[PDB]
Design an enzyme around this catalytic site. Sequence first.
Site, short mmCIF file in Angstrom:
data_model
loop_
_atom_site.label_atom_id
_atom_site.label_comp_id
_atom_site.label_asym_id
_atom_site.label_seq_id
_atom_site.Cartn_x
_atom_site.Cartn_y
_atom_site.Cartn_z
N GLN A 131 0.82 -1.20 0.00
CA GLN A 131 0.00 0.00 0.00
C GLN A 131 0.87 1.27 0.00
O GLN A 131 0.44 2.33 -0.45
CB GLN A 131 -0.96 -0.01 1.20
CG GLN A 131 -1.95 1.14 1.13
CD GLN A 131 -2.88 1.20 2.31
OE1 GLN A 131 -2.50 0.87 3.43
NE2 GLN A 131 -4.10 1.65 2.08
N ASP B 114 2.42 1.65 -3.54
CA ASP B 114 1.23 2.10 -4.33
C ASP B 114 1.07 3.63 -4.20
O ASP B 114 1.06 4.33 -5.22
CB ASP B 114 -0.09 1.47 -3.84
CG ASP B 114 -1.32 1.84 -4.70
OD1 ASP B 114 -1.79 3.00 -4.62
OD2 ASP B 114 -1.82 0.98 -5.45
N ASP C 19 3.02 5.79 -3.39
CA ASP C 19 4.19 6.53 -3.82
C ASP C 19 4.05 6.71 -5.34
O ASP C 19 4.32 7.77 -5.89
CB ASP C 19 5.46 5.73 -3.51
CG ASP C 19 6.69 6.57 -3.82
OD1 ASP C 19 6.74 7.15 -4.92
OD2 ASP C 19 7.60 6.63 -2.97
N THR D 223 4.14 11.69 -8.25
CA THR D 223 5.23 11.42 -9.19
C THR D 223 5.28 9.92 -9.50
O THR D 223 5.06 9.11 -8.62
CB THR D 223 6.59 11.93 -8.62
OG1 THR D 223 6.87 11.31 -7.36
CG2 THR D 223 6.54 13.43 -8.40
N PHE E 53 7.90 8.11 -10.41
CA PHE E 53 9.14 7.52 -9.92
C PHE E 53 8.96 7.03 -8.49
O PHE E 53 8.20 7.61 -7.73
CB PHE E 53 10.27 8.56 -9.97
CG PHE E 53 10.33 9.31 -11.28
CD1 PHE E 53 10.77 8.68 -12.44
CD2 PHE E 53 9.89 10.63 -11.36
CE1 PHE E 53 10.76 9.34 -13.65
CE2 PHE E 53 9.88 11.31 -12.56
CZ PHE E 53 10.31 10.67 -13.71
N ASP F 106 10.14 7.43 -5.57
CA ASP F 106 11.02 8.37 -4.89
C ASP F 106 10.58 8.86 -3.52
O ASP F 106 10.88 9.99 -3.13
CB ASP F 106 11.24 9.57 -5.81
CG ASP F 106 9.93 10.24 -6.22
OD1 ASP F 106 8.87 9.63 -6.01
OD2 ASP F 106 9.94 11.38 -6.74
N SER G 38 7.85 9.93 -2.56
CA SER G 38 7.05 11.14 -2.63
C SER G 38 5.94 11.17 -1.58
O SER G 38 5.44 12.25 -1.24
CB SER G 38 6.44 11.30 -4.01
OG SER G 38 5.63 10.19 -4.31
N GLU H 77 -5.65 6.84 6.20
CA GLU H 77 -6.70 5.93 5.74
C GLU H 77 -6.99 4.76 6.68
O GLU H 77 -8.14 4.31 6.79
CB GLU H 77 -6.34 5.34 4.38
CG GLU H 77 -7.44 4.49 3.80
CD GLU H 77 -7.28 3.00 4.07
OE1 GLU H 77 -6.20 2.60 4.57
OE2 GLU H 77 -8.22 2.23 3.79
N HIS I 105 -5.91 -5.36 -2.21
CA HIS I 105 -7.14 -5.27 -1.43
C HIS I 105 -7.60 -6.62 -0.94
O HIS I 105 -8.36 -6.73 0.02
CB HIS I 105 -8.23 -4.62 -2.27
CG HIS I 105 -8.08 -3.16 -2.54
ND1 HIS I 105 -8.80 -2.50 -3.51
CD2 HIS I 105 -7.29 -2.23 -1.95
CE1 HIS I 105 -8.46 -1.22 -3.50
NE2 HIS I 105 -7.55 -1.03 -2.57
C1 HEM Z 1 -8.50 0.72 3.54
C2 HEM Z 1 -7.50 0.31 2.46
C3 HEM Z 1 -6.47 -0.59 2.58
C4 HEM Z 1 -6.02 -1.43 3.85
C5 HEM Z 1 -6.51 -1.33 5.12
C6 HEM Z 1 -5.82 -0.65 1.28
C7 HEM Z 1 -4.75 -1.45 0.93
C8 HEM Z 1 -4.10 -1.54 -0.30
C9 HEM Z 1 -3.00 -2.44 -0.58
C10 HEM Z 1 -2.45 -3.37 0.54
C11 HEM Z 1 -2.63 -2.26 -1.91
C12 HEM Z 1 -1.53 -2.96 -2.74
C13 HEM Z 1 -0.67 -3.92 -2.31
C14 HEM Z 1 -3.53 -1.23 -2.45
C15 HEM Z 1 -3.55 -0.70 -3.75
C16 HEM Z 1 -4.35 0.34 -4.25
N1 HEM Z 1 -5.54 0.82 -3.69
FE1 HEM Z 1 -6.22 0.42 -1.62
N2 HEM Z 1 -6.48 0.22 0.43
C17 HEM Z 1 -7.51 0.82 1.09
C18 HEM Z 1 -8.40 1.76 0.54
C19 HEM Z 1 -8.43 2.30 -0.75
C20 HEM Z 1 -9.38 3.29 -1.33
C21 HEM Z 1 -10.57 3.95 -0.59
C22 HEM Z 1 -9.01 3.52 -2.61
C23 HEM Z 1 -9.65 4.47 -3.67
C24 HEM Z 1 -10.55 3.60 -4.56
C25 HEM Z 1 -11.24 4.37 -5.68
O1 HEM Z 1 -11.27 3.84 -6.81
O2 HEM Z 1 -11.75 5.51 -5.46
C26 HEM Z 1 -7.85 2.69 -2.85
C27 HEM Z 1 -7.17 2.62 -4.02
C28 HEM Z 1 -6.06 1.88 -4.42
C29 HEM Z 1 -5.20 2.17 -5.54
C30 HEM Z 1 -5.34 3.26 -6.62
C31 HEM Z 1 -4.89 4.72 -6.61
C32 HEM Z 1 -5.11 5.95 -7.42
O3 HEM Z 1 -4.56 6.01 -8.55
O4 HEM Z 1 -5.82 6.88 -6.95
C33 HEM Z 1 -4.08 1.17 -5.46
C34 HEM Z 1 -2.95 1.14 -6.49
N3 HEM Z 1 -7.54 1.98 -1.72
N4 HEM Z 1 -4.39 -0.83 -1.46
CA LIG Z 2 6.50 8.84 -6.42
#
Ligand code: HEM
Ligand SMILES: [Ca+2]
Length: 583
Positions: A93, A96, A98, A172, A174, A176, A178, A246, A339
């Site tokens: 997470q 992600d 970052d 960003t 990268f 990094d 962020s 979150e 998720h």
């Molecule tokens: C609560 C939430 C988590 C845990 C208690 C949780 C966890 C993860 C993990 C462990 C991920 C990858 C290994 C991961 C990826 C991405 N998520 Fe999730 N996450 C929780 C809650 C949310 C919520 C709310 C969102 C937004 C969903 C939407 O579509 O509006 C969410 C998103 C994402 C996401 C996308 C990001 C973006 O470009 O805005 C991952 C790459 N997560 N999460």
């Molecule tokens: Ca970044």
Amino acid sequence: VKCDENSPYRTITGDCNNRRSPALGAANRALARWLPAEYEDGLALPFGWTQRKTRNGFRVPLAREVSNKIVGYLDEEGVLDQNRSLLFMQWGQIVDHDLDFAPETELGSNEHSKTQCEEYCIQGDNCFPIMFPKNDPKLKTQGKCMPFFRAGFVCPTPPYQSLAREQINAVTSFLDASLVYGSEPSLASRLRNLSSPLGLMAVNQEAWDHGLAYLPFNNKKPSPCEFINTTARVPCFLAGDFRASEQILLATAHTLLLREHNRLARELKKLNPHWNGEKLYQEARKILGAFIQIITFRDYLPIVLGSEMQKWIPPYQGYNNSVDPRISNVFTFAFRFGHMEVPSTVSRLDENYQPWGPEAELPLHTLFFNTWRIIKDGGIDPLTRGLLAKKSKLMNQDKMVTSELRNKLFQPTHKIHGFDLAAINLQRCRDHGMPGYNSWRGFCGLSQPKTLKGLQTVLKNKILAKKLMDLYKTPDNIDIWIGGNAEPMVERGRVGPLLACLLGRQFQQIRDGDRFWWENPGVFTEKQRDSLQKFSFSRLICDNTHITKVPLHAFQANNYPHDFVDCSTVDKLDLSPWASREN
Ligand code: HEM
Ligand SMILES: [Ca+2]
Ligand SMILES: *[C@@H]1O[C@H](CO)[C@@H](O[C@@H]2O[C@H](CO)[C@@H](O[C@@H]3O[C@H](CO)[C@@H](O[C@H]4O[C@H](CO)[C@@H](O)[C@H](O)[C@@H]4O)[C@H](O)[C@@H]3O)[C@H](O)[C@H]2NC(C)=O)[C@H](O)[C@H]1NC(C)=O
Ligand SMILES: *[C@@H]1O[C@H](CO)[C@@H](O[C@@H]2O[C@H](CO)[C@@H](O[C@H]3O[C@H](CO)[C@@H](O)[C@H](O)[C@@H]3O)[C@H](O)[C@H]2NC(C)=O)[C@H](O)[C@H]1NC(C)=O
Ligand SMILES: *[C@@H]1O[C@H](CO)[C@@H](O[C@@H]2O[C@H](CO)[C@@H](O)[C@H](O)[C@H]2NC(C)=O)[C@H](O)[C@H]1NC(C)=O
Ligand SMILES: *[C@@H]1O[C@H](CO)[C@@H](O[C@@H]2O[C@H](CO)[C@@H](O)[C@H](O)[C@H]2NC(C)=O)[C@H](O)[C@H]1NC(C)=O
């Protein structure tokens, strides 16, 4: 805005990484498109929007319904990952957040649309409601829908008209760090302690964790953290990323990395007394960013991708300016496989790694935007021990997403613990114009099943396949998120063939297209690199908490006390190679 052309440090916005094309990979630009966007009206309307208009001849199933039929389960027993710690899920997470962030559309603050979507569920403009199917318990208790707003797009925000809708990435591309320092100049400044020429990050002045720091509190109210316990009135934390609070374990990890910065900054001032505040900030920030890339590429990815790692991410061979470092719109859904690794409870352990109190284990849904449990109930040491001694949830075709997220998700804007992260993800693929499942199977050179029987062979599950086809009618309509996550896992990994391909490419691209990759000759010195090769998450813990027993490999399932060694046996980051001699 302006490239320092010879600066040894990344910029906050991500700009100037690439010399020929400076904005490449910077924050606040569109998510890259590996495939053309697929919208109902071919320009911006998502599939499912106009009830009447099919997708390949059929109606797309309700998000919430796929959630009810496919994604949910009751029995939380047997669901744990026998060989992945809770840190496995947690580090994903972080990486992600970052790499990507598609903020919802705003134009709301004294708006009756934020209420017109909530209250009456009327689809329109940016309100794209998640309607409850018939026979849904939430109809009886919550209403007829779950408000959902379309993600933001580039050029504008107001109505618009021109090209195909392209979502924004407010961070960003990268890797990094962020999420610690921010992606905008104004946020990055706010986060720093510009009162002392020590180059430290700002900390809390209202509370301490055994002499250790806490993230500052967010100045802005209404704060969702204060809402979940009107009596404790503890606000959310202020970090480089807006989602930091979150959930409690995420804010915990955020605190560990803030601590690491200041820790590096004061260890540097000691070695190089002459350096100024900007120098301290930048040099520490550069080490932390190297830390994220090492932990992620050395310890994390190998166990996500498995036997498919080398196939998609071959040995490093240098920076390649021809590679597109940007995060693709599909990656933001492919990485959501995480998720399904989130368990239902969160534990707090004491110093012997035994339950911590009466209420040591808590329901995941009680921890969303929960900051008071950290501040007013033990600090972060009890939570960190949980991350090491406890396991992640194993993805299971019959048990995908825990009800804690599936039915009790708390949204910072709304007042109830009743959202469905599974339906939201499905509704989000559509919002983002994602191509169907077979379109991605083909992109990755994988068979594209067209019949029920075919889908059974790919999924290797007759029942799951059967349910998927009753809802979607054609494998071509299956939403990528649920599609890629239903595939069996690859040897020694945690995602199937499709997900490996999508993740593999992205990571290989952001590593090969990054002028500042740590292994990139000239970014660090052979000696500095020799030092960095020893960084480890276990060590990050030893130097920023009061835990003294830790595992050598914090990502695998470790049993206490057998797998836990004393912090002395764990390698240290020798910062000596950073000493700078004058004359
Ligand atoms: C609560 C939430 C988590 C845990 C208690 C949780 C966890 C993860 C993990 C462990 C991920 C990858 C290994 C991961 C990826 C991405 N998520 Fe999730 N996450 C929780 C809650 C949310 C919520 C709310 C969102 C937004 C969903 C939407 O579509 O509006 C969410 C998103 C994402 C996401 C996308 C990001 C973006 O470009 O805005 C991952 C790459 N997560 N999460
Ligand atoms: Ca970044
Ligand atoms: C930096 O990253 C770049 C971006 O990915 C890389 O560029 C690739 O460069 C290769 C050439 O080195 C490009 O084409 C390849 O070369 C062959 C053609 O000369 C292709 O083979 C065959 O083409 C057709 C099949 O399509 C055959 O009929 C024909 O007989 C010939 O054999 C290769 O299959 C391959 O495409 C390639 O397109 C570029 N990658 C892309 C898609 O951008 C580059 O490798 C990197 N640079 C360095 C030096 O590190
Ligand atoms: C909202 O947050 C409150 C804290 O900010 C929290 O109250 C705390 O509740 C626990 C037990 O419910 C109390 O802890 C223990 O207190 C003494 C020891 O100091 C014991 O004798 C008690 O038995 C108890 O176990 C805290 O003292 C209490 N804090 C205060 C000052 O109120 C609420 O539980 C939270 N409520 C919700 C809705 O989440
Ligand atoms: C638990 O997971 C770990 C990591 O996935 C497994 O150990 C790794 O096994 C590979 C063999 O392919 C070794 O090359 C690595 O050195 C191991 N990791 C480390 C750092 O030891 C371990 O085998 C798993 N346990 C089980 C039962 O599968
Ligand atoms: C900015 O950094 C300075 C450190 O130089 C912090 O000031 C110290 O604060 C600690 C803890 O409150 C005290 O023990 C010291 O007395 C302070 N030292 C000096 C010389 O000021 C300051 O708190 C930091 N500010 C923020 C917002 O984090």
